[PDB]
Amino acid sequence: PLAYEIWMCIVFAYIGVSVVLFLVSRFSPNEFGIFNSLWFSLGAFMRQISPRSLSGRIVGGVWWFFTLIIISSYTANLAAFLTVERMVSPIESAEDLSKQTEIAYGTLDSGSTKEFFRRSKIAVFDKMWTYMRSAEPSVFVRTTAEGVARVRKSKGKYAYLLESTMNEYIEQR
Amino acid sequence: PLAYEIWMCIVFAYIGVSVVLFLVSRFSPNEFGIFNSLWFSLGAFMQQGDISPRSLSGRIVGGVWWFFTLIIISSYTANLAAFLTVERMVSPIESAEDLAKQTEIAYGTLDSGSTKEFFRRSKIAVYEKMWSYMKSAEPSVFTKTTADGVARVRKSKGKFAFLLESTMNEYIEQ
Amino acid sequence: PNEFGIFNSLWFSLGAFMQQGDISPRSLSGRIVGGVWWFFTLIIISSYTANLAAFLTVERMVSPIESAEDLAKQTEIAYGTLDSGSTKEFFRRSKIA
Amino acid sequence: RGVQMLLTTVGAFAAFSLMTIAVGTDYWLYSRGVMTHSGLWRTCCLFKGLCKQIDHFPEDTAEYFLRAVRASSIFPILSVILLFMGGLCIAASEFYKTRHNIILSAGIFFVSAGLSNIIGIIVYISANAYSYGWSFYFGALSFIIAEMVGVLAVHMFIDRHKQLRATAR
Amino acid sequence: KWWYDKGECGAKDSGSKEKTSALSLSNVAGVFYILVGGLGLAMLVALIEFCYKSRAEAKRM
Amino acid sequence: KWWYDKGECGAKDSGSKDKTSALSLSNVAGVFYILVGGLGLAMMVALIEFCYKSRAESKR
Ligand SMILES: O=c1[nH]c2cc(C(F)(F)F)c(N3CCOCC3)cc2n(CP(=O)(O)O)c1=O
Ligand SMILES: O=c1[nH]c2cc(C(F)(F)F)c(N3CCOCC3)cc2n(CP(=O)(O)O)c1=O
Ligand SMILES: O=c1[nH]c2cc(C(F)(F)F)c(N3CCOCC3)cc2n(CP(=O)(O)O)c1=O
């Protein structure tokens, strides 16, 4: 939750505030030391020694409020993910089959669907027919219920294409 | 999630309690300084904390301020959790039953045409309720032209909707 | 040293296990073991907080069945009538969808 | 020495002046059925130009008690009276300082008056249930200056107590 | 038709109950009140204890 | 040709992903901004107070 890229921003801000705290604490002529300042920044990051320079203590306090807001928002966003649990489908549009190749897709071995994909003029469907006609292994199923059992035993790896009415009928069973 | 005005009162109570600490710590040491009193007030304001007092009065001022701001930031946590729970609520409109299930966002059709004749001569009770809403709206939701309905939806910001053909909707979408 | 005792090590492990805490170490290795264990159990008890919040959010969900549209809106809890009677004739000869 | 006392005196004077300006007018602003200003006793709209006393106290017992506190400004008027009494005590203790113990009671009364002013600001904020006027910011800044002047006054008091303890030995 | 559908109340036990309110100050005002009460209590207790300490120091001499 | 290529809109890609099923970033950049601002402010205050302390100590 809350970050897929901003974790590196958190770590970089941690190292930067550690450098600022060491620059304040170890330049006044106790709490000095690069490992001591880094471990005090670690102690400020999570919950559980204090500086007395009254200028880097402001840095420690604003970082301390900063990571408090971070862990509060972390608790809130983790509760938000645990609350709704509305997982979505990976495929939305018709170009998604052209966009990826991990989850496979196929049609029936014989019928007007294969002639539609074969005699198509759209380059997207041309790439679809090139992928399905050169698929390894053969994605073509014999009957409709064989394709239904192929999709139901795929666990999100292979899909089947057919008419919309039959698909919506099987969807309601 | 809380406000933009309670925070100034929180800062005012913070600096007031720091004034209390700098008063009473110098009225009976370690918290003799103004930065010492302000720093202990900051440590009492957050969860964690440094320099432990030993007096009755300073510790009871800390106990007053400290559970206070504990309940405040716990309420901040719960309020932000509630706002993010709001953030992943109900999906947008995707069916006519979604239109029948709500009443906040209004909708309309064209004032004339076989579109209005479809709802007027309907038999499905959902579309019959739709025509009951459109025939008894206050004021009239009907526009004279198509572009009038387009401008009515564009000046709504999520308050009025329009029903039309799918090809015309996909063309005006593009 | 300060954490020479087994109770000292167990007490600092207890302090690192919770949020708050006492006796600060000074070594590289002890502080990095604390940093490994401490953010770990931080994420654990934060997940406990969020999980209990999710369970209490479940605890105040949807009210029980109060209308026939409530029966039509669900499919988990089944329902039935008597095998014969004007009750079954009411549903058989109905006009409301 | 005397420069800090004169700074504390002019800070108390400026705080009392801003408190009087907060009592006077333009305390809050709320768009009524056009905008309008208010000073916790009457409202003035932006016909136009007229003013009227809109401090209507009627339309558990805790809501009625909170409405009774918010009506007629019980907290901030008595807070301003306590600030005036503390300023008079500071002016009486500035010249002919016979006893060195009334300054602590004057500072305690001044800090308690500031705390009552903050409590009255909390009551006036809770009675609002969209922007704010100038006199609310002026009262907040006067609270800041009063807190700083109280810190300076108790600092001068502990310096005088340390001087008395050094001269008595 | 003439009761559930003819009227203007299209709630019909609506699930849409978003109500995106941040926070009321009524949850904050009494907590401010008990804050000010605790602060005044601590002020008066500290004043009477230092007054008794000064009286005992003057009586002990 | 006439509904998709003739049109003045882009591809139907709601954007990066399908919807906002992921991390928030909106408050994150602003709290980063106020952290950088407070960091630079406290850094310049520390610099000027150490300069004043060095000027007081070098001149006794
Ligand atoms: O004229 C035709 N009418 C068809 C009618 C149907 C349906 F009505 F849906 F039963 C189907 N199926 C599609 C999926 O469910 C199983 C059979 C196939 C048909 N085909 C073969 P196509 O060449 O693949 O279209 C025809 O030729
Ligand atoms: O015979 C009819 N043919 C129609 C053909 C079209 C178009 F799609 F442009 F070809 C449209 N529009 C679709 C919506 O935006 C305005 C124009 C309306 C038509 N109407 C009026 P309706 O009765 O309201 O459908 C007819 O009567
Ligand atoms: O004429 C009829 N009079 C009925 C009178 C009653 C009673 F209420 F006890 F008086 C009942 N019951 C109500 C339910 O529990 C079992 C007995 C059933 C009746 N039925 C059968 P229905 O057609 O299923 O209503 C009739 O036919």
Tab-separated table of C-alpha atoms in Angstrom, chain D residues 45-110:
chain	number	residue	atom	x	y	z
D	45	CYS	CA	-24.560	42.693	5.704
D	46	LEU	CA	-22.450	43.735	2.727
D	47	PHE	CA	-30.839	46.869	2.977
D	48	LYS	CA	-27.125	47.396	2.372
D	49	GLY	CA	-25.306	49.227	5.167
D	50	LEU	CA	-27.772	48.440	7.956
D	51	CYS	CA	-26.843	46.405	11.028
D	52	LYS	CA	-28.904	44.344	13.461
D	53	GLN	CA	-28.296	42.325	16.627
D	54	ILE	CA	-28.302	38.760	15.307
D	55	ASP	CA	-27.094	37.234	18.609
D	56	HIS	CA	-30.222	35.141	19.110
D	57	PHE	CA	-29.686	32.576	21.868
D	58	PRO	CA	-32.935	30.643	21.133
D	59	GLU	CA	-33.860	29.530	17.622
D	60	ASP	CA	-29.418	17.292	26.599
D	61	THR	CA	-28.736	20.257	28.877
D	62	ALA	CA	-25.136	20.430	27.606
D	63	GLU	CA	-26.245	21.990	24.304
D	64	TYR	CA	-28.297	24.633	26.130
D	65	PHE	CA	-25.367	25.330	28.469
D	66	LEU	CA	-23.013	25.679	25.486
D	67	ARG	CA	-25.506	28.047	23.847
D	68	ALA	CA	-25.701	30.045	27.089
D	69	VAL	CA	-21.898	30.288	27.193
D	70	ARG	CA	-21.736	31.326	23.523
D	71	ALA	CA	-24.456	33.928	24.089
D	72	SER	CA	-23.476	37.398	25.402
D	73	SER	CA	-19.717	36.474	25.314
D	74	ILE	CA	-19.252	35.324	28.902
D	75	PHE	CA	-15.704	34.012	28.416
D	76	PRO	CA	-13.941	36.732	26.306
D	77	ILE	CA	-15.428	39.789	28.060
D	78	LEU	CA	-14.384	38.460	31.478
D	79	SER	CA	-11.051	37.500	29.892
D	80	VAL	CA	-10.582	41.111	28.745
D	81	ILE	CA	-11.533	42.326	32.243
D	82	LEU	CA	-8.912	39.974	33.711
D	83	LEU	CA	-6.357	41.239	31.164
D	84	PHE	CA	-7.139	44.835	32.167
D	85	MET	CA	-6.772	43.915	35.851
D	86	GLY	CA	-3.454	42.204	35.120
D	87	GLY	CA	-2.252	45.238	33.185
D	88	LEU	CA	-3.239	47.472	36.099
D	89	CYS	CA	-1.382	45.136	38.475
D	90	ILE	CA	1.702	45.243	36.229
D	91	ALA	CA	1.517	49.050	36.104
D	92	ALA	CA	1.213	49.139	39.902
D	93	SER	CA	4.165	46.747	40.284
D	94	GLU	CA	6.318	48.642	37.769
D	95	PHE	CA	6.732	51.676	40.053
D	96	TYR	CA	7.414	51.501	43.820
D	97	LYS	CA	8.220	47.781	43.919
D	98	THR	CA	7.936	47.228	47.665
D	99	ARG	CA	7.071	43.516	47.791
D	100	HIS	CA	8.610	41.095	45.278
D	101	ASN	CA	5.748	38.568	45.454
D	102	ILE	CA	2.787	40.272	43.739
D	103	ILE	CA	4.469	39.952	40.324
D	104	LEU	CA	4.061	36.160	40.397
D	105	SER	CA	0.342	36.469	41.172
D	106	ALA	CA	-0.006	39.089	38.420
D	107	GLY	CA	1.725	36.794	35.928
D	108	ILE	CA	-0.419	33.841	37.019
D	109	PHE	CA	-3.562	35.954	36.565
D	110	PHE	CA	-2.285	37.073	33.146
